[PDB]
Amino acid sequence: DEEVAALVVDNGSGMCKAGFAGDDAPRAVFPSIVGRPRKDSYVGDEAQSKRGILTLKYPIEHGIVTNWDDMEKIWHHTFYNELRVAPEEHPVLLTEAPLNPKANREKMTQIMFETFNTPAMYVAIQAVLSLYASGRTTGIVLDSGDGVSHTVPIYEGYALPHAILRLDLAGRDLTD
Amino acid sequence: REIITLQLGQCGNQIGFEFWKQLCAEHGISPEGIVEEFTDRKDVFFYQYIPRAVLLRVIHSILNSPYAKLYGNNWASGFSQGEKIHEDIFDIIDREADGSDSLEGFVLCHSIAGTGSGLGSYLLERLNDRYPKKLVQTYSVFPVQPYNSLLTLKRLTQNADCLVVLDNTALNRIATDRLHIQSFSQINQLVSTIMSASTTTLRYPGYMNNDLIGLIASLIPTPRLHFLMTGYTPLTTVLDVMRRLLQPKNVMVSNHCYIAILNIIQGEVDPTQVHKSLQRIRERKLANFIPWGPASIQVALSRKSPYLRVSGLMMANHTSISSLFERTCRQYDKLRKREDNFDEMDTSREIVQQLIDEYHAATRPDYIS
Ligand SMILES: Nc1nc2c(ncn2[C@@H]2O[C@H](COP(=O)(O)OP(=O)(O)O)[C@@H](O)[C@H]2O)c(=O)[nH]1
Numbered sequence: 001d002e003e004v005a006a007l008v009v010d011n012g013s014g015m016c017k018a019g020f021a022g023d024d025a026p027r028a029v030f031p032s033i034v035g036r037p038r039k040d041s042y043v044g045d046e047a048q049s050k051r052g053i054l055t056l057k058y059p060i061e062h063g064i065v066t067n068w069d070d071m072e073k074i075w076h077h078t079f080y081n082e083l084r085v086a087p088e089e090h091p092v093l094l095t096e097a098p099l100n101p102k103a104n105r106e107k108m109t110q111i112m113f114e115t116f117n118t119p120a121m122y123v124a125i126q127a128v129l130s131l132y133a134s135g136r137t138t139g140i141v142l143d144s145g146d147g148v149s150h151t152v153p154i155y156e157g158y159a160l161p162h163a164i165l166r167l168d169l170a171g172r173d174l175t176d
Numbered sequence: 177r178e179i180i181t182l183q184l185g186q187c188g189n190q191i192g193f194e195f196w197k198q199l200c201a202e203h204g205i206s207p208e209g210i211v212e213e214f215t216d217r218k219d220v221f222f223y224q225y226i227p228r229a230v231l232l233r234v235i236h237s238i239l240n241s242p243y244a245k246l247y248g249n250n251w252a253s254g255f256s257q258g259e260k261i262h263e264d265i266f267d268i269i270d271r272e273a274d275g276s277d278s279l280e281g282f283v284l285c286h287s288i289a290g291t292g293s294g295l296g297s298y299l300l301e302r303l304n305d306r307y308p309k310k311l312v313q314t315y316s317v318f319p320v321q322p323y324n325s326l327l328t329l330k331r332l333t334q335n336a337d338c339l340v341v342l343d344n345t346a347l348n349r350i351a352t353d354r355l356h357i358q359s360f361s362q363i364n365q366l367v368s369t370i371m372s373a374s375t376t377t378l379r380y381p382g383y384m385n386n387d388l389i390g391l392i393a394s395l396i397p398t399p400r401l402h403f404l405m406t407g408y409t410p411l412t413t414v415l416d417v418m419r420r421l422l423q424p425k426n427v428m429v430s431n432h433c434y435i436a437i438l439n440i441i442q443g444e445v446d447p448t449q450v451h452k453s454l455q456r457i458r459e460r461k462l463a464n465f466i467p468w469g470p471a472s473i474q475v476a477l478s479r480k481s482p483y484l485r486v487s488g489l490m491m492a493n494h495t496s497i498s499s500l501f502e503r504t505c506r507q508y509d510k511l512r513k514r515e516d517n518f519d520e521m522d523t524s525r526e527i528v529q530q531l532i533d534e535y536h537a538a539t540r541p542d543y544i545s
């Protein structure tokens with residue numbers, strides 16, 4: 001093969017899933033959390049394990065990135081700790097929530113190319129990828145995760161933003 | 177080992193209640209006495225969490241506080257009423273002592289200025305009767321006030337195993353000087369910081385000073401000279417904190433020489449330069465020491481509570497503390513010539529005269545014999 005492996009990173013409100021394109025399942029899954037003392041930054045399971053001595057942050061609590069400084073740390077963690085690869089050496093496919101603000105899409109792009117120096121990247125809507133996985137390009141996806149749920153109508157591969165609905169009721173609420 | 181605290185009179189309850197608030201917030205303990213999620217050895221002062229307090233009107237305002245889930249004026253009047261409830265309050269102590277793993281001492285917080293002062297003098301004697309092998313440290317607070325002050329002094333000089341003096345005249349001057357208050361609930365903020373800082377090396381274990389006798393065995397040279405004074409500077413290098421503690425403006429006390437000094441540095445300071453500073457402080461000769469026996473200065477580090485920067489506390493044994501007794505002594509004589517036996521006042525007046533006589537003779541090259 002001439003091409004290096006491409007990375008697939010699913011940014012979840014509660015859990016991030018990361019791995020290599022072509023694989024049947026993610027190689028790693030970890031909590032979307034970053035913690036600092038009440039090693040300076042803790043990310044993923046370690047932040048959770050040592051939460052007793054840390055102040056936890058959830059940078060993508062409801063599917064949308066709210067703190068880019070900590071989101072950058074989650075991505076750093078993803079590449080160097082979880083996947084053990086150098087991002088500048090692999091194309092990266094990232095996922096985003098439905099109705100993700102345009103400015104956020106540009107921010108993610110700028111960070112990948114300027115901060116991680118990715119050779120290539122792409123961003124796809126989560127619901128659309130799930131529909132693809134089912135072997136379809138048209139249909140409506142009900143995506144219910146940890147911090148948010150969405151109903152996303154998709155036609156011919158394109159999500160229909162005007163018909164997308166967000167429900168602030170998901171796994172977290174059910175646990176409580 | 178554990179240490180049971182007692183709180184007598186209006187002052188003891190207030191400064192003890194503020195001591196426990198500060199000590200609860202210093203740890204991870206909610207006002208409901210339940211541990212919050214959020215290393216610090218807390219078994220000495222907390223019981224599995226329950227404080228090992230014995231409180232003795234003010235109790236109601238404590239029970240109406242958010243911390244409810246955490247549990248006349250003569251000296252003779254304060255002494256007799258303790259005799260009639262002698263059996264009562266000890267049952268609380270007897271169960272707490274035997275319920276304790278291995279008791280070590282008895283912290284007493286009280287003001288010697290009057291029912292609480294009288295009750296204190298009574299309890300200090302009985303503890304010598306029952307428990308002979310338990311230290312009794314008293315966080316007494318100085319102010320018919322001259323009468324009551326010297327009587328309790330007669331007991332504090334032969335019963336209490338250690339004593340830390342805190343006089344209101346030095347604390348009140350600080351509040352007006354560096355705090356500009358012009359209240360009791362305001363100066364107690366400073367008293368709580370000194371008390372909480374005094375037992376810092378007990379709750380955060382280190383290589384040394386893991387027991388109450390470890391701090392006292394160095395300062396007090398003989399069982400008679402068991403009076404101490406305090407110093408708290410931040411109201412940063414370690415050389416800065418030492419030099420600010422040895423200034424007279426910071427001490428909480430209104431020739432003479434030092435007997436022993438203990439320094440508590442609670443910051444995140446560099447622990448490699450601590451041995452350097454003690455080399456240079458000796459050269460400037462900022463303090464004069466006893467000529468008869470050898471004496472030195474002691475510095476001990478610790479760690480501040482992360483759940484809540486450099487601070488410092490200095491426990492010293494200065495013979496200039498004899499002056500405070502002199503004021504009470506002289507104030508007594510003036511009232512004695514102005515107005516069943518009145519013989520106890522005579523013995524108390526006599527025994528404190530020997531204590532003062534020890535200090536003035538403790539500064540001579542022949543204090544031996
Ligand atoms: N340092 C300090 N001393 C206090 C405080 N409250 C009261 N005192 C002292 O307690 C004395 C009054 O005692 P009092 O409460 O009348 O005795 P009781 O009526 O027998 O409880 C005064 O002389 C004060 O110096 C306080 O908050 N801090």
Ligand SMILES: Nc1ncnc2c1ncn2[C@@H]1O[C@H](COP(=O)(O)OP(=O)(O)O)[C@@H](O)[C@H]1O
Nearest residue numbers: 011012013014015144145146147148170171172
């Ligand atoms: N078998 C299950 N039954 C019910 N809830 C589940 C199950 N497995 C996982 N969950 C819940 O699903 C949520 C995580 O799903 P996920 O789609 O990964 O969310 P996100 O992408 O937002 O982090 C959590 O609330 C978790 O408790």
